[PDB]
From a paper:
Considering that histidine is a slightly positively charged amino acid at physiological pH, we assumed that a histidine to valine substitution in H3K36me3 would enhance its binding to PHF1/19. Indeed, the H3K36me3-H39V mutant peptide exhibited approximately twofold enhanced binding to PHF1/19. To gain further insight into the leucyl patch interaction, we also determined the crystal structure of PHF1 in complex with the H3K36me3-H39V peptide. As expected, the trimethylated lysine 36 is inserted into the same aromatic cage. V39 instead of H39 is located on the hydrophobic patch mimicking H3tK27me3-V24. P38 is structurally conserved in both complexes. Taken together, valine is a favored residue type at this position, which could snugly complement the PHF1/19 leucyl patch. In summary, the valine residue is an optimal residue in the recognition of the PHF1/19 Tudor domain.
The three human PCL proteins all contain a single Tudor domain followed by two plant homeodomain (PHD) fingers and an extended homologous (EH) domain. The Tudor domain-containing PCL proteins are essential components of the PRC2 complex that maintains gene repression, and the Tudor domains of PHF1/19 have been identified as readers of H3K36me3 in vitro. In this study, we provide structural insights that the Tudor domains of PHF1/19 are also able to recognize testis-specific histone variant H3tK27me3 via a conserved aromatic cage, a salt-bridge, and a hydrophobic surface, and both H3tK27me3 and H3K36me3 engage the same binding surface of PHF1/19 but are bound in opposite orientations. In the complex structures, PHF1 and PHF19, adopt a classic Tudor domain fold with a five-stranded antiparallel β-barrel.
Residue numbers in the entry:
A (entry chain E): 31 to 42
B (entry chain A): 27 to 85
The structure:
């Protein structure tokens, strides 16, 4: 998405 | 057999950190068994078919 930020579905 | 992955499909893709990220398939490359996946920051990378899961199966 325009302006989007990748985040993982789950962190370690 | 019925395709598992296709253009436009929302998927989870395993990245090189071993974690999963939301993405959209932009291209299926059948010979190489990869898709070009667009992630939430609009970056586009090749991911192997085995490292892609459909977000939803109807069901």
């Amino acid at each position: 998405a325009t302006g989007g930020v990748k985040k993982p579905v789950r962190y370690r | 057999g019925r395709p598992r992955l296709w253009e436009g499909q929302d998927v989870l893709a395993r990245w090189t950190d071993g974690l999963l990220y939301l993405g959209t398939i932009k291209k299926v490359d059948s010979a190489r068994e990869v898709c070009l996946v667009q992630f939430e920051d609009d970056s586009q990378f090749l991911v192997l078919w085995k490292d892609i899961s459909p977000a939803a199966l109807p069901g």
